[PDB]
Write a protein that binds this ligand. Structure first.
Ligand SMILES: O=C(OCCO)c1ccc(C(=O)OCCO)cc1
Length: 497
């Protein structure tokens, strides 16, 4: 059972059970406590002897998901301060040059962890892939911009963990030259951010963007506003020097309140006109700080960032229904609301018709959901694929179309449902995908992910702007499709950002 591997910071003890060596809670950065909430991740103190790497470590401080989301997306909080840790699954640490997959969890930069059961790496290890997951700093601590703190610590954490992988994964049987980094949404947007970040150079050879693209950044001045509001509500200065002492429950509380206010209609008196106008999608997304992130990841990618990196990208067909549907309130959304929403992107009311004509929404709420799926995920994802037309690296796309049965099927192929199929952790995600999700689909998606990590090819035709081909994952039939939803797609050609 017990298996001991040398890391850069000293020896770790995992456990091999059934030809899988599992290491949990390998620290890649010192506990980011107090002032170190907001410092660059520090190499862990290089211990002598054997540190236990058998239990998942603490996870980053996060608020609960909203009641709606949270019933579907059941997080596993692990208390503690020492959460800048990573987990490795390998079939054999003595293996030569196994594909390494580094998982960057999503959760809108405020939630999630590497260690959520659904992100279990065993299924990747069983297929000859070294799997790495890890926690990175979230929310205020991870990403709120402060004048006296390096920006985007959660991003610096991701780099640190990817650098850990670079420096250590060979001792867990992995090829540091064959690292596929992958993430869901905020994790995928992170990947996009990393492609745009000098400090991530060469840290991954391939990327799987699962329902996340290069549009999730906060302008510096909006991050400054967010930090200021956070601070005013904490009765302290908008500085790391101040926030280093706020009890995390009060950080999270104010953080949570910022998240909801930005998710809703932000008061312009509180937030300024930009943020009230919607300049901020996610308020704790990486800040365009100028150094780590000189520009929005989409523009960097449009200019060739990550073009040397093989890309498997995709979205869930009904992604945003996760956020609009599970409270039973989709039917109350109105056409004029969709029209006003369309108008924010300079689209006329009748753009909604294209959604209806393409099976993407009978009622306004259905359309809004699809519109938002397009605006924040599918079109940004496609803009990345389009930017890579001349990239030396390969681009493959997918659409996760399997509709979850939960809540009478109201969710469709909503956000996150592809996670347990990717990880073959379907029995850990029944709150989201129900009790009897098709395991064949899990095998299919997972093997494609394994194939992509292994060779840069998921096993289906490459995505190009000619045919815009993607693997439409569903059950019983996952089959290639071409240029899915072209009319709604063509709606966004001139839409800013
Ligand atoms: O809709 C989103 O942002 C637009 C704001 O209006 C959104 C972004 C990221 C995530 C995420 O990281 O989900 C992964 C959960 O495992 C979820 C939702």
């Amino acid at each position: 059972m017990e298996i001991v591997i040398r890391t850069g910071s000293g020896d770790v003890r995992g456990s091999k059970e059934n030809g899988i060596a599992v290491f949990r809670g390998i620290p890649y950065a010192e506990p980011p406590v107090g002032a170190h909430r907001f410092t660059a991740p520090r190499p862990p103190r290089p211990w002598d002897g054997v540190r236990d790497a058998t239990e998942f470590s603490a996870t980053a401080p996060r608020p609960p998901y909203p009641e709606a989301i949270g019933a579907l997306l059941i997080e596993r909080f692990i208390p503690g301060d020492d959460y800048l840790t990573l987990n490795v699954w390998t079939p054999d640490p003595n293996a030569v040059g196994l594909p390494v997959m580094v998982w960057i969890h999503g959760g809108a930069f405020t939630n999630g962890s590497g260690s959520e059961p659904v992100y279990d790496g065993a299924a990747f290890a069983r297929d000859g892939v070294v799997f790495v997951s890890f926690n990175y700093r979230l929310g205020i601590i991870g990403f709120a911009d402060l004048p006296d703190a390096p920006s985007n610590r959660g991003l610096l954490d991701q780099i640190a963990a990817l650098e850990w992988v670079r420096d250590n994964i060979a001792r867990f049987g992995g090829d540091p030259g064959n690292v596929t980094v992958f993430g869901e949404s905020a994790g995928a947007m992170s990947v996009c951010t990393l492609m745009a970040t000098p400090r991530a150079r060469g840290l991954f050879r391939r990327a799987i963007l699962q329902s996340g693209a290069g549009n999730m950044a906060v302008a510096a001045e909006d991050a400054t506003t967010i930090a200021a509001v956070i601070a005013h509500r904490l009765g302290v200065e908008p500085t790391a020097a101040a926030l280093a002492h706020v009890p995390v429950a009060q950080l999270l509380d104010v953080q949570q309140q910022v998240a909801q206010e930005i998710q809703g209609a932000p008061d312009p008196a509180v937030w300024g006109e930009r943020i009230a106008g919607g300049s901020v999608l996610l308020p704790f997304a990486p800040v365009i700080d100028g150094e780590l992130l000189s520009q929005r990841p989409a523009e960097a990618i449009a200019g060739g960032a990550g073009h040397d990196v093989d890309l498997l990208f995709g979205t869930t067909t009904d992604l945003y229904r996760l956020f609009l549907a599970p409270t039973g309130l989709l039917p109350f959304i109105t056409s004029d609301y969709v029209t006003a929403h369309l108008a924010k992107s300079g689209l006329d009311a009748d753009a909604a018709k294209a959604y209806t004509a393409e099976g993407r929404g009978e009622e306004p709420g259905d359309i809004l959901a699809s519109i938002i799926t397009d605006q924040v995920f599918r079109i940004p994802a496609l803009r990345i694929a389009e930017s890579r037309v001349d990239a030396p690296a390969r681009t493959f796309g997918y659409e996760f179309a399997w509709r979850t049965p939960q809540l009478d099927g109201i969710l469709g192929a909503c956000h996150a449902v592809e996670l347990p199929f990717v990880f073959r952790t379907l029995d850990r995600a029944a709150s989201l995908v129900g009790t009897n999700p098709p395991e064949e689909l899990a095998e299919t998606v997972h093997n494609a992910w394994v194939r992509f990590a292994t060779s840069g090819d998921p096993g289906w035709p490459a995505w190009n702007p000619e045919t815009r081909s993607v693997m439409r994952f569903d059950h019983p039939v996952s089959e290639m499709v071409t240029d899915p939803y072209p009319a709604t797609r063509a709606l966004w050609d001139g839409v800013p950002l």
